[PDB]
Amino acid sequence: DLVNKKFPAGDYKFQYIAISQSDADSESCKMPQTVEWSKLISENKKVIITGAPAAFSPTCTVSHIPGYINYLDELVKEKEVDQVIVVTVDNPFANQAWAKSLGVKDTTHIKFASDPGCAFTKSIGFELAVGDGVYWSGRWAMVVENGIVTYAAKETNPGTDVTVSSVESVLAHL
Amino acid sequence: DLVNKKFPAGDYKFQYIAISQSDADSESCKMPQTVEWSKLISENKKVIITGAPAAFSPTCTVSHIPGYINYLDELVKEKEVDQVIVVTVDNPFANQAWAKSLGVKDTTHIKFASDPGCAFTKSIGFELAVGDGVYWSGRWAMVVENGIVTYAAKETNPGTDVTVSSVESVLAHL
């Protein structure tokens, strides 16, 4: 378990695609950006990551994620949170589109990260096995302060559950 | 190469989620279904399969897929064609959703199939390498008649090009 040890950034990366009003005002059709995990973390005092099995799946779309979009405001401003990252292993175009259908207008404090082939997610033991060796993210949530993991929980039944991974539970540790 | 041999179904299976008119009169809110490639082909006299790299990505979404939906009707009523399968490595929920966004109303003759971990597309050699072990599908088309590949082609620059994989080419070879 990763609680209160260093954040194991390694050299892992992710890709999200920007979403903005101000840009919307200024036309750009977005291609994926690449962030180093190590870079994000050592550039922001306070980060929330949560993992989701599959973009557009009922559990993640109705029951898990919308929560974080709602509390985004309380998170950034009251709890001093810096970045909230949503993680799936789904392509960053499908993650951007998913982020949109959910109501996200601005990616400055919220980002929908790909973890290509679950590399990162596996390396912390928070993946979900789906068969013939294919790996999705689990449903989980993680809090990093100062470069230290202060919170990290995995759902036992991600398919259906959203509990230890829920923005509420997260807030409780904030 | 794959043309003129028997369809290399082996024992691979894909997943999809249904869309329907009769079940709007019935409001069933579906999960994925499994289909053995082999059975699909055995059950069917004429199958168009096309593979695309990334769900909701610009070439896939704009230049490529619409064609196959555009001409869904002539393929079926003037070209004897039983099924048209769109293949990605994306999740069935992200696929069904992409489908609906392209304006699909029923899965009777079109199906957005997931080939998880690129397993099937790797086995035929139509994969696209994207790094760190990760593979997306390439941009490809293929026709299979009475259990045999009459047509199989792959784009060289799938990121940009909609040619040999176009529904125009498929149509020309039917």
Domain boundaries, chain A: 1-174
Can you read off the two tokens belonging to residue A73?
Answer: 């405001």
B24 contact partners, CB below 8 Å, separation of at least 6: none
CA distances from B86 to A95, B22, B33, B92 (A): 19, 22, 15, 11
Percentage helix, strand, coil, to 5, in chain A? 30, 30, 40
Can you read off the two tokens belonging to residue A102?
Answer: 């959910």
Q: Which of the 8 DSSP states describes residue B159?
A: T
Q: How many CB atoms lie within 10 A of CB B23?
A: 13
CA-based nearest distance A142→chain B, Å: 24
Q: Identify the closest residue of chain B to A116 by CA–CA distance.
A: B134
Resolution as reported, in Å: 2.9
Contact residues, chain B, for A29 at CB < 8 Å? 58
The phi, psi pair for B113, rounded to 5°, reads -90, 140
Q: How many CB atoms lie within 10 A of CB B136?
A: 24
B118 is catalytic: no
Q: Which of the 8 DSSP states describes residue A43?
A: T
Q: Can you tell me the distance from the alpha carbon of B77 to that of B72, in angstroms, rounded to the nearest whole number?
A: 9
Q: Is the dihedral of CA B130, A92, A34, A23 positive or negative?
A: positive
Question: Mapping DSSP to helix (H, G, I), strand (E, B) and coil, where does residue A135 land?
Answer: strand
> Inter-chain contact A93–B133, Cβ cutoff 8 Å?
no
Q: Across the strands, what pairs with B110?
A: B84
Q: Which of A172, A158, A91, A138 is nearest to B60 (CA)?
A: A91
Q: Which of the 8 DSSP states describes residue A116?
A: G
Q: Which of B125, B152, B151, B127 is nearest to B138 (CA)?
A: B127
Pairing status of strand B46-51 against strand B83-88: parallel
Q: Across the strands, what pairs with B138?
A: none
CA-based nearest distance A57→chain B, Å: 5
Q: Which residue has the tokens 């919308």?
A: A66
Q: Can you tell me the distance from the alpha carbon of A92 to that of A100, in angstroms, rounded to the nearest whole number?
A: 12
Cβ atoms of B153 and B142 closer than 8 Å: yes
Contact residues, chain B, for A61 at CB < 8 Å? 93
| CATH for A1-174, options being 3.40.30.10, 1.20.140.10, 2.40.30.10, 3.40.630.30 | 3.40.30.10
Task: Give the method of determination.
Answer: X-ray
Q: Identify the closest residue of chain A to B120 by CA–CA distance.
A: A132
CA-based nearest distance B163→chain A, Å: 22
CA distances from B18 to A89, B41, B97 (A): 23, 19, 10
The phi, psi pair for A75, rounded to 5°, reads -55, -65
Kindly report the length of chain B. Answer: 174
Check CB contact of A10 with chain B, cutoff 8 Å.
Answer: no
